[PDB]
């Protein structure tokens, strides 16, 4: 079963969520098992250009109207879901198809490369605003419990 890969000493550097100095942050190379109804935490992210890196699958940026996601490293699975779709289900009964474009990197964090932010958790679907709106979820919540599965085409 999926175990941590290690941990990193927090540094807040110049980040204004930021890593905090007195702690350690865990890293992961794996994610939970992928089932036909995979339980995950949906977070909120913008994939647009300006003022974060290019999307891992394509080297591109995506404006907030695009329904795109990043997956925790384990689910990202070396790129095997790149430019494939996943079906996301929210607890309120809404669902949306989203394009996998990026990795939510759980292997590294708390450095200038990641704006001194912590490493992604290992069960994350990091969704654009349009994913949240399609799910009828309140973007002020910051995170939501979801399920997802690989979609056919």
């Amino acid at each position: 079963t999926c175990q941590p890969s290690g941990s990193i000493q927090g540094r807040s550097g110049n980040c204004n969520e930021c890593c905090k100095n007195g702690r350690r942050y865990t890293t992961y190379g794996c994610s939970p098992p992928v089932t036909g109804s995979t339980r995950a935490v949906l977070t909120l992210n913008s994939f647009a250009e300006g003022g974060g890196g290019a999307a891992a699958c394509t080297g591109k940026f995506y404006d907030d109207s695009k329904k795109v996601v990043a997956l925790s490293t384990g689910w990202y699975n070396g790129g095997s879901r790149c430019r494939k779709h996943i079906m996301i289900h929210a607890g309120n009964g809404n669902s949306v198809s989203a394009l996998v474009v990026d990795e939510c990197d759980s292997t590294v964090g708390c450095d200038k490369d990641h704006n001194f932010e912590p490493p992604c958790r290992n069960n994350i679907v990091d969704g654009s605003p349009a994913v949240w709106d399609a799910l009828g979820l309140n973007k002020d919540d910051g995170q939501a419990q979801i399920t997802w599965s690989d979609e056919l085409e």
Binding site: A54, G59, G79
Partner: protein
């Protein structure tokens, strides 16, 4: 604790070294474009580049120079008069038909390393680029050779930053690397593979190569009455980073960590 403080310096040190690594991107790209814009290949240019490197030998720093003597480091020592790492050959890791520069469903983009048909090392890659130009009787030998020599020093210095980066990464992620280095199940060869894998962050690689492609396109803009760049100029700028600079830097980093296994 004493440990925690040492890790924190280490991250601070790594951040600064990473900035230094990225700072080579634009100069390498500008130097390639300057030589490509300047003209065709001068008679005996390759020979003149070696003579220039021989006559104007810059020696590496003392720490690197010694490292180059040690066996691990000696694989990055070049035949005189070439600078360090420009003869190092990474093993072929891609297939002949690997798609290099566009998104592939179920794989991603910008796969790193050499295909069988790629030149063995950076010296041969740049030599091949030069040979693809026609011999020119009007190109200025001094300018052309000087830009060639500039590029060789730039690419060598860029990848050699892997060595101090590796030492900073080792202190920053001490437990991660020692868990590999102290594993008595692994051969020296398997430890190298696992270290390289721990050192590899392809999402960061895509970030770099996306920007390199963008820079090469933007900086190769033609203005009124300019002579065009030779075909594939932008392709070869990307290939330099994707097939050589990134994987060689990583390998230098892995070599360095392996040299400091006694610190576990």
């Amino acid at each position: 604790g004493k440990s925690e403080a040492a890790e924190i310096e280490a991250g601070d040190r790594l951040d600064a070294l990473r900035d230094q690594l990225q700072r080579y991107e634009t100069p390498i790209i500008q130097t390639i474009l300057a030589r490509s814009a300047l003209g065709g290949r001068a008679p005996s240019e390759q020979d003149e580049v070696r003579a220039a490197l021989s006559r104007n030998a810059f020696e590496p720093s003392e720490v690197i120079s010694e490292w180059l003597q040690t066996e691990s480091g000696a694989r990055f020592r070049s035949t005189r008069p070439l600078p360090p790492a420009v003869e190092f050959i990474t093993p072929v890791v891609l297939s002949r038909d690997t798609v290099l520069d566009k998104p592939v469903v179920g794989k991603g983009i910008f796969p790193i390393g050499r295909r069988p048909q790629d030149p063995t090392n950076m010296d041969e890659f740049l030599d091949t680029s030069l040979l693809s130009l026609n011999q020119s009787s009007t190109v200025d030998l001094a300018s052309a050779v000087s830009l060639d020599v500039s590029l060789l020093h730039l690419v060598s210095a860029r990848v050699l930053l892997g060595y101090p980066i590796a030492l900073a990464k080792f202190d920053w992620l001490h437990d991660n690397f020692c868990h590999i280095l102290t594993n008595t199940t692994l051969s020296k060869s398997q430890k190298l593979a696992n270290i390289i894998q721990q050192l590899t962050d392809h999402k960061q690689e895509v970030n770099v190569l996306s920007r390199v492609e963008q820079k090469s396109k933007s900086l190769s803009h033609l203005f009124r009455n300019d002579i065009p760049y030779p075909p594939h100029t932008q392709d070869r700028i990307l290939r330099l980073f994707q097939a050589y600079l990134i994987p060689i830097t990583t390998q230098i980093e892995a070599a360095a960590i392996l040299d400091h296994a006694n610190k576990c």
